[PDB]
Amino acid sequence: MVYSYTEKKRIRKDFGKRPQVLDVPYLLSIQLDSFQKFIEQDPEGQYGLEAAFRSVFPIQSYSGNSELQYVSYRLGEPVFDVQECQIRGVTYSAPLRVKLRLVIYEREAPEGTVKDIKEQEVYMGEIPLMTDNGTFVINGTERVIVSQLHRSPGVFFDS
Amino acid sequence: SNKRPLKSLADMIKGKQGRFRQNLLGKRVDYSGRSVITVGPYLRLHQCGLPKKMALELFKPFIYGVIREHPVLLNRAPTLHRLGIQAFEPVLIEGKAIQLHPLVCAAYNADFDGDQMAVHVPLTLEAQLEARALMMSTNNILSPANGEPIIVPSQDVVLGLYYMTRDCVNAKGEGMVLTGPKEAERLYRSGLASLHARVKVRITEYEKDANGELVAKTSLKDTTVGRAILWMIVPKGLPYSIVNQALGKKAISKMLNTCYRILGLKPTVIFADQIMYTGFAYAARSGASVGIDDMVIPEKKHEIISEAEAEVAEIQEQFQSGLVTAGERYNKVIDIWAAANDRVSKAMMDNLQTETVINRDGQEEKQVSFNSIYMMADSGARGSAAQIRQLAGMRGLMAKPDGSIIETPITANFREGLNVLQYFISTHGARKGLADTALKTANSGLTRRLVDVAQDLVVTEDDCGTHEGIMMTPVIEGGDVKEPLRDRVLGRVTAEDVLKPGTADILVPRNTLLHEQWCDLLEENSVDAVKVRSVVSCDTDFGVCAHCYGRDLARGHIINKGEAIGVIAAQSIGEPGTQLTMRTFHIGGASSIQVKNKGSIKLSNVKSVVNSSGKLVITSRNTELKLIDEFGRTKESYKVPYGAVLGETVANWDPHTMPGGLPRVADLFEARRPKEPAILAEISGIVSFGKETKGKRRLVITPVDGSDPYEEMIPKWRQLNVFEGERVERGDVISDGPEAPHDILRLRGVHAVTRYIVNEVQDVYRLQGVKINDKHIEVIVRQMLRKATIVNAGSSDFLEGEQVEYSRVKIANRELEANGKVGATYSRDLLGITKASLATESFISAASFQETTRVLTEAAVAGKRDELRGLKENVIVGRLIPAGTGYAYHQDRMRRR
Amino acid sequence: AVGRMKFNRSLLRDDIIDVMKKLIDDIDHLGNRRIRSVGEMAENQFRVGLVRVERAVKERLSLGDLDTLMPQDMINAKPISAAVKEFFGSSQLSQFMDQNNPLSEITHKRRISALGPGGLTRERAGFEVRDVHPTHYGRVCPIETPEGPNIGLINSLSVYAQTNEYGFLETPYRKVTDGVVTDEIHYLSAIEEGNYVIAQANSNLDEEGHFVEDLVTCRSKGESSLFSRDQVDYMDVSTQQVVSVGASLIPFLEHDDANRALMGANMQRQAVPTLRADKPLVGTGMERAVAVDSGVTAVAKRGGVVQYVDASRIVIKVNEDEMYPGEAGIDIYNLTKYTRSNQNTCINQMPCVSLGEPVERGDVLADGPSTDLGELALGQNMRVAFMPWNGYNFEDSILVSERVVQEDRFTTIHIQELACVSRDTKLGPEEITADIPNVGEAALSKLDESGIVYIGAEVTGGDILVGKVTPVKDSSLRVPNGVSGTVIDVQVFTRDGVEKDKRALEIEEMQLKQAKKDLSEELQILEAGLFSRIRAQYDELKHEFEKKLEAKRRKITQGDDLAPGVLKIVKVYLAVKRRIQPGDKMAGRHGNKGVISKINPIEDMPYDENGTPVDIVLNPLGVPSRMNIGQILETHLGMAAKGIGDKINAMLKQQQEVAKLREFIQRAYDLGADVRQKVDLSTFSDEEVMRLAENLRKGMPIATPVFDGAKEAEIKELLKLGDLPTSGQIRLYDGRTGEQFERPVTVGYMYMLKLNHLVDDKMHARSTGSYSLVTQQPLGGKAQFGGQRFGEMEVWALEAYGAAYTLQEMLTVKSDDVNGRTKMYKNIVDGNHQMEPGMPESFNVLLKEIRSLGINIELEDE
DNA sequence: TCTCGCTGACCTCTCGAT
RNA sequence: AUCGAGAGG
DNA sequence: TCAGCGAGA
Ligand SMILES: [N]C1=NC(=O)[N-]2=C([N]1)N([C]1O[C]([C]OP([O])(=O)OP([O])(=O)OP([O])([O])=O)[C]([O])[C]1[O])[C]=[C]2
Ligand SMILES: [Mg+2]
Ligand SMILES: [Zn+2]
Predict the structure, then answer these.
(1) Residue of chain C nearest B98, judged by CA positions
(2) Residue B113 CB less than 6 A away from ligand 1
(3) Cβ of A20 and C704 within 8 Å?
(4) CA-proximal residue: ligand 1, atom 8 (nearest)
(5) Which cysteines bridge via disulfide bonds (chain A)?
(6) Do A8 and C692 touch (CB under 8 A)?
(7) Architecture of the C239-295+371-410+579-762 domain
(8) I need a surface site. Which of A8, A42, C374, C819 has the fewest CB within 10 A?
(9) Phi/psi of residue C306, each to 5°?
(10) CA atoms of B171 and A32, how far apart (whole Å)
(11) Which fold has domain C411-498+560-578?
(12) Angle C556-C560-C564 (CA atoms, 0-180°, nearest 5)?
């Protein structure tokens, strides 16, 4: 009843009576799924850095007809891997490269077309990366950010 | 910038973390250590295992220029009472952990668990002298809360003593005549005779003569080999009947108490050491072990479960019969499941007790089984009956998410497996058990309020010379005498000469301490009730005296001048709640009157109506039922509910339908006012009952012998039923309801209110199995009754009705009567412990306790002055307290030059 | 979006009006609370940084410019970086990971907290939030909660629990159609499962899947009641669905009360890994999953044949089907070796494979801490005797045989990191050179020419590791006191612009040369295969190899971003082995715990008829007082398992044909009333059977799933097969006297754990030292070398005793009386001890604070 | 008489960030 | 020092 | 939070 080579070396005697129909899932699947939703590219602005950008990216003067935009974003390769991040005592993070765009329209001429569009790629801070074990390396110390149990948004009636 | 609000100047004075409670009441000290504690069975009571690593540092200035000449103080973290700090003589040991004596574990609540204790070094010569004379573990034989010994064999020692002294049928070596205990030991060691063999031994015993001399008595007694061997460590002066029985925890406790009463201090500590050694040795030799087969599952449970399930199914008759309301259904389900639980517990206990059938010399006799679980149970070492029935019977009912109980039962024990549903149900009880020690301990930590309300009292004089006292009566509420008259009167002076049944003959003259011999003499008489000198009716001003107090429970004899009785009383009252809330998780989160003897039906304070049938139905709300036998009135007290109808059954009612513990103790100590009570004010004898057009029916009560009447307003809605209740006593019940302690005081008296408070507190304490002496509650009540309002002062300096210290009013009245003036009349006021502590003369104590900003504002605007006469003030200003050793210095300070 | 969905669902759907209409016409329920993980919180912090950047952009662009406005100057990355750095490092939910063992890490990563920003408060929380709810079933473990103020608020995820798209916890259930259970699985949330009636896992089923019993126990609407087959809609997927990962590791959990199960689940997390990981003889079968998913064990990414084996590294030759077209075909697994932990324990990886052994995907190649052949091994199997022994196991205490200490079964390695930081100072008072003023010749020779200590040197208390002098008083880093160990690693950190001393250059370049040699060897190992293939673009491969080597060298030589004001940081790692002694906390998996009180000689321990003594002696009185019968059942089952292992070992000692071993092991695996496991040895080869028997010679491991474990009859049968009494109790003889104990004593093997509560870490003793500034009182910590707090309750105790002088000296002479302390120390040292207590400085502080409030408080003389 | 602020709710250890 | 997060009793 | 407390309305 042992197929893996590791288990074939020493098979544990199982006294269980109930057949197993669903195998135990990955124990750290919650952290991996959460950070993968946060990091991975989202075609829609529903989850992650994409949804975060669609919130306050259009910063502009009031009725100035010149707004700041962007096209996409990309996460670079980390300078150091986990082991030497722990050794050096530095955060294991990946630089964030975002391509922003700016549009210029005619002054007091909304009917006229946009005068010019300026797009350029800009570095925006360091985003810490989570290792394969679901943990974070911050300042050379290995850290875990636990999930939070908070009341679901909405309306409830209680006394 | 930080999220938390900035701490202002007042925040550094008030609160738990303020200057007072964090730096003046409690300081960090030098010469202190800490480590884990391990068990040393080789230690004596005055000894503990102190690692050399600590001793090199703690005694470093002493080393520069010692372990035996200088004791040390061991201290556990809670320190619920005084015995949480004790003095030991240290013996240097290798390693890091501290070796603690097994006997002081109960006093410290210590346990070899990962638990830790602190070490303190008395530096000055006086500190060492007081450590040796007061805080030594050898001087701490008796508990301060009650005269019971605090060091007691437990666990392994109890099991060893219970194994030695138990007997077996047809054991090896039965029936042989022995020349003494030494021969019994020789046959045991040689393997010729068993330890449980019923033999006949020649025992020489000593009993104290009239002059106190020891005279020997030699006789052949039917005993066992184990009891004979055990007799060798029993000191001279005790009867052989102490060991001639299967010794449980209670038996060993009683034996130690008897040894202390007869012989004294040093014989008691030597006897305790010998008992511990013998118990450890013979528990090791016994080879007692726990196994899965030791738990026997009776076949009666498999039928009791079905009976209870059918009972509840019938009780909930498909919700179509009616009366399936949530209040009635839940109560009846709980009652049925509790009945099933106790039935199964009894069945399993009965199966375990006589599980052993032993073949005698040609006879198949039956005896008490030697089952391991049972031997751990009745010995009383560790393991309650609830835990045992959880193991081998059922788990029963569990704690609800709310304060209530689960409707569904676990219907399974722990030897058999539990379903996941049943385990999920029991998780609720687990959460409740851990939450009680996590959060409810704050409610107990009541203790601080009791400490501060009473910390000022110190025994100041030998005796008042007064004659007032309080009635002492047994408690027979539960069908048996829970508190005999000996327990109430022991170690307390007598205010009035106790007279023998009849007249002109007095068994006990007044002003004599009722010790064990006097209590035995009183028990020789068939009936006795003694008026005992109390502390609430104490004529001493600014303190209490020894005679009105009684005997020092820890030291046995009469209390000395200088003892801080208030702190001891507060600790004794506050410990049991704290200790019992912690031990809640140990459990695991789990209609008629019948008399002992038949006879004619008697009643007291009963009003009843004739039913349609011949049966009598009670109408009064408060009715007591007591039976009389063919010889005398039977000694029980029972309560007959409103709707009740009347080994003989003499009462019947339905508890479900009428046709808290520490919260209750706090309510009693805070002098809470119930809404309902309405009782007569002044003894008159005539109630006018005049017709009044007002909605609230008005009652005018006019004296037979007095001209001035009294008028009261009695709302009809608030008090539906009103009685006559005339001139029996000022305070007679006019309307049904829980009596208010303030009204009870004002109308009946200080003694009556003290009796009410003491009884109501002790009922709650006794329901949980706690035993505390009544003098502590009397001290607390005395602290409650300290303020008086001077109505119609007359020649006194008091202005109109203002709250004033009762001692000041009494002193002023005495001075005026010396000069001939009339003096000031007053009425005693009942104040809760919080309010009474906040109303003290000293503002430093009040500021340290609570309400720091308000107390400081009052003292500042009023320009108050603190004389620093109490314990807390001298602790804060870092001087000698006016108690114990510093009492003489403080008296010298008061007398000045 | 989840909020809008909840708002629509609650009102069965101007928005403010509809709320009032239903108001005129349980919060702890799961449907009202959702899970917020690290990703969503990081997104929220990014939103905060981004709105700050947007405000800055609006402020900068309000001026307006023609062709002078670009994306660069408008935005700034400083606020976003600051916000994310604050979140990762200072947030309440960003916690220092528990790294005692793999189970602790798993529990921490699966932890759920009700506290945190936008959440509850522990002191404000009541009993309703802290109690178990009918919706906790399968989503949150009811057993595992903290024992302190955080009870009920801090919770652990169940084994099978997930989160849906909206963030609500859900559980898997087996769909029941037409009275037969169907293998398809539907995940249901609390509000979704409330409608349905769910059968129990403990429901007997036939071969076709129909329920055996006519009436099947179920639950509905938060209550459990008996149901017929027709109404059943869903069934539990497993018996472990409710317990968490930590609670599912306890064998025979249904025989314990939930209190002791909680205690065991918590104490499994403080278990310290030992020298050798020892598998649990009695287990559940979740050890492999925990060990694999913890990530402490090297797991073969691709299946292949092992090519190189070493303590430090393992090389796998990937199979032909698993190699990428551009891949050379070599997988290298470097192993962690003696690295410090968060809790100062040791992390070690040891290979569990041999050269040439075939390996498939997912196989364990190295064993992390507390892991034995891919199985979690938190402790050591110990032979326990439940019997009192002269009071040395009196009150929950534990007595340990000296053979346990001799065999180093519970010896643990603890690594301590010490750092020496040199800071910039004007006029150059601080020195870092090896030569220091007033330094002993032996101490100077202990350190290298660079001023740092040699790797591998034994250091005791009061020895300098790194040499430093500052004005010049010696600022050299030294071990504080007492702590002793060996220098296993030294790390030197210098910035890119920080000046490097030649001796410091020597040490740093030695370390960098070692790292570069390791990197070059690792690169050449993979390049050898490509070079051999080319022999059968050599210049291009050589150029690529040189470029990779240069990049690795540049990365190694890249200066570290040191904090401003400091030049160099030298870190010294000390490793020491802690041996068990009286005072060390020991515990099992069933809530039982204790402290070793005596190390008993081997001959004094109780021994069997065969002369084999027991290792651990436990008081039997602790078993029935508590409700942990699971420990007794595990003891019996471990005795049976060790009996089977002893029979196998006996057949191995005298040469026996493989047929007999195969027959016995097949009989042992086939034993049981009805077990799903069917181990067939006929499939195995002779060498495989011999290796299995070699692994089983120390005891056959047993798996007992929670709420599905072995029955008593099966344990008795296993005891029978091993030629052991079925009662589980054997006749023991006293070692000191040779006299048989009068009653049979249960003896078996229980899995004992060593907790991170060593007595040497806890033993402390202070005579005198530093005092606080605001109040002249001793400090308040062992690290600060402070005294013990003499709280108010202890003052009450001394008042009750009447110990006036002891209380006075503790209040004044031992604290807050500066003149009193100064005179008392001289009096004690001189031998003639007299004290004159004075006013505590804290009272003067109180007086000054009250006077600063505007209230005049004074000391009236008379 | 009833809202309405104001008051109240042991010891020890580890870690990092300010 | 303070705060946050844990842990032991 | 959850009580209990007196003092304004
Ligand atoms: N003030 C205060 N607040 C608290 O929250 N806790 C305290 N004290 N303790 C102290 O520690 C004893 C119980 O701990 P434990 O683990 O030994 O439990 P236990 O039942 O006695 O024995 P066991 O663990 O073997 O089952 C208890 O009295 C007390 O002094 C524990 C918690
Ligand atoms: Mg303990
Ligand atoms: Zn008196």
Answers:
(1) C583
(2) yes
(3) no
(4) B78
(5) none
(6) yes
(7) Beta Barrel (2.40)
(8) C819
(9) -60, 130
(10) 70
(11) OB fold (Dihydrolipoamide Acetyltransferase, E2P) (2.40.50)
(12) 165
